[PDB]
Write a protein that binds this ligand. Sequence first.
Ligand SMILES: *[C@@H]1O[C@H](CO)[C@@H](O[C@@H]2O[C@H](CO)[C@@H](O)[C@H](O)[C@H]2NC(C)=O)[C@H](O)[C@H]1NC(C)=O
Ligand SMILES: *[C@@H]1O[C@H](CO)[C@@H](O)[C@H](O)[C@H]1NC(C)=O
Ligand SMILES: *[C@@H]1O[C@H](CO)[C@@H](O)[C@H](O)[C@H]1NC(C)=O
Lengths: 200, 184
Amino acid sequence: HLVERLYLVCGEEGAGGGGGSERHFVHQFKGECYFTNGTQRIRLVTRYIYNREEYLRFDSDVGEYRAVTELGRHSAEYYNKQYLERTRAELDTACRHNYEETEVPTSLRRLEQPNVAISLSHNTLVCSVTDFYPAKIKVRWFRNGQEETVGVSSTQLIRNGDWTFQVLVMLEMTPHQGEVYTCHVEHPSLKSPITVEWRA
Amino acid sequence: EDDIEADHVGFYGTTVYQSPGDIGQYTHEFDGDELFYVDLDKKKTVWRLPEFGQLILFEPQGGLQNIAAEKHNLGILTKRSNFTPATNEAPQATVFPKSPVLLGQPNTLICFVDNIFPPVINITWLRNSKSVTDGVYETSFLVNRDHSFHKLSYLTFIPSDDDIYDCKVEHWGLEEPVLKHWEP
Ligand SMILES: *[C@@H]1O[C@H](CO)[C@@H](O[C@@H]2O[C@H](CO)[C@@H](O)[C@H](O)[C@H]2NC(C)=O)[C@H](O)[C@H]1NC(C)=O
Ligand SMILES: *[C@@H]1O[C@H](CO)[C@@H](O)[C@H](O)[C@H]1NC(C)=O
Ligand SMILES: *[C@@H]1O[C@H](CO)[C@@H](O)[C@H](O)[C@H]1NC(C)=O
């Protein structure tokens, strides 16, 4: 009882209208489904791009194809004649279907627990939080049982490309005998936080 | 030039085609990560992680359909643009480990390459200035909001005190290969 992932159809322009040293010419189509509060709100945006210029767009909040630049002026009239009702219908048959029937049992159930380690690198403690999914996470620093607000800094969220993330969170500190510093990580994969302590 | 607000975003999917050379790709993404690509020559769906395809299918014909339509659209738009060619961009790389580096414990070195356009590139690895091809994997070209691409390459490695690494990137937009260095 395999379930099928569906796709957004790339519409074709009407014809006859109106290598490091070689020239190249590039075209792109992007079909984007935006979801909020499950499938309670869905927005569909499809984009047609020549080289780097998006020239034609369907946006379900607008309800029809529109020219994004002058290059797409007559494209939008042709696509609205030929593909308008088909594209409107893809919000349910493609976006809603993929979310409810394929993302709910897979992507949205994926939970990878973070690994947490502390290193010292005047000075600064670095808490490395690695290999977690999804991206939502909270990392807190404590000194002798009290939470630190500064100097707490963080790198950007790092996307590893393998459906995991990592982040580094730094604490400006001066070591004294014999304090305890704690990196404290809350993540949807964890019922209770993971903590690591570091001592002078 | 303003984000759309959403809890989740699926790309179902993204297609790119370029001429000459008949080079194209078709992928789906969810929340910015690759679900699969369609091997257009083999006509088969290749999942990013094998588990993704255990309960779910994608018919490769959908990717073939999008690529055929994009080849058609490219012909029309190329003429309409007065045959304006693509601009070769200079890609930029950063290298980082997947996990904190521990002596003798297998790890993965990641070469993140951004500002790729057109989507043709070579990313390769050096260890102690010698080419390494064992244990190397690459993502598809992943889309950027400005319609360039990024790509990641992966190198299995075992951290030691006697190894130096480089990610090497070759691209039409680079006069000479760029080397991104990394050491523990
Ligand atoms: C990626 O690497 C390949 C292989 O080194 C390059 O293809 C070679 O290109 C040289 C010079 O252009 C040719 O003389 C060889 O015959 C090619 N070899 C093969 C096996 O095709 C390719 O050009 C590189 N790509 C980029 C973007 O630099
Ligand atoms: C989320 O959606 C459900 C049903 O789709 C609705 O009943 C609920 O009120 C929504 N929550 C918010 C905060 O809008
Ligand atoms: C098209 O390109 C040619 C050659 O680059 C140029 O002479 C011409 O002015 C351009 N514009 C039009 C409308 O032909």
